[PDB]
Design a binder for these strands. Structure first.
Ligand code: SO3
Lengths: 53, 107, 92
DNA sequence: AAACCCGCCAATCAGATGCATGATG
DNA sequence: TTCATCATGCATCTGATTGGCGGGT
């Protein structure tokens, strides 16, 4: 059981994704160091909600 | 108006909204620049038409919505009101249209 | 080409999911991530099919009808035919 | 019981959008 | 030659990213 319409394109994508892992060789808790810091630094209510300056 | 009943009429409503409601071809739920970056991630892809990410913007909106509603049905059957990853995994296995996601969502 | 260029932003995906569910519903973070990965592959999967057809026909631009043709070829006929109506409106 | 974990909040700044230019067919 | 439409670079400014807590799961 494989979708005959998608079979060839699935294996084309599997090889393509394998190249891209090899190339991008190097998910994270956060994406950006600057925004992570912003959120940690920011003032919060007692509930842990962010608020205005 | 049960979960299975709104999924049954899903494409009827999609086509009604396409035929009636006046669209905004700039404003989307998904940003066009990121859709284009995903397309450009493929080395074989060279140039992309302005129309292509616009079609994907609406296509992906329909896709996320359809799969979310399919996954929600599995959540209701286990009497949970929190949508899990296993609910999406269960939804993919119910239609061979999702066979392309076999490597993305294993088992 | 950044490594996050492969995926759509999780907040935009999570908002569409939220609209598709009843008001009281909750969504797990893994479900948001899973959906982000699925919809991103949806784009890559279809675009790859359209891309290879453009190569064989010696065309550089992946255009609108190439995406619809690919969607039909790969068994997304509901998406192909619905977005064909949507396209004729945009062009109108 | 008792782990587990997702919605709530809004400011910064990564990046999305829109326009001018030159290339391309 | 002209037209339609692409990538690219740049200016403008906008909304995605972000985490501690509590109570629902
Ligand atoms: O069986 S799947 O790998 O096409």
């Amino acid at each position: 059981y494989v979708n005959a319409k998608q079979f060839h394109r699935i294996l084309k994508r599997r090889v393509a994704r394998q190249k891209l892992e090899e190339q991008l060789r190097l998910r994270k808790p956060y994406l950006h160091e600057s925004r992570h810091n912003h959120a940690m630094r920011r003032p919060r209510g007692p509930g842990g909600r962010f608020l205005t300056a | 108006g049960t979960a299975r009943d709104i999924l049954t009429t899903y494409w009827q409503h999609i086509i009604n909204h396409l035929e009636s409601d006046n669209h905004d071809y700039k404003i989307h739920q998904l940003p066009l620049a990121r859709i284009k970056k995903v397309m450009k991630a493929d080395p074989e892809v060279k140039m992309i038409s302005a129309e292509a990410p616009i079609l994907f913007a609406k296509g992906c909106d329909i896709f996320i919505t359809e799969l979310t509603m399919r996954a929600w049905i599995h959540a209701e059957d286990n009497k949970r009101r929190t949508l899990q990853r296993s609910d999406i995994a269960a939804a993919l296995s119910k239609s061979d249209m999702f066979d392309f996601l076999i490597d993305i969502v294993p088992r | 080409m950044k490594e996050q260029d492969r995926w759509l932003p999780i907040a935009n995906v999570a908002r569409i999911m939220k609209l598709a569910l009843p008001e009281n519903a909750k969504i797990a973070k893994e479900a948001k991530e899973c959906m982000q990965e699925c919809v991103s592959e949806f784009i890559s999967f279809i675009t790859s099919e359209a891309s290879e057809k453009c190569q064989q026909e010696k065309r550089k631009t992946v255009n609108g009808e190439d995406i619809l043709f690919a969607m039909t070829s790969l068994g997304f006929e509901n998406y192909a035919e619905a977005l064909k109506i949507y396209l004729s409106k945009y062009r109108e």
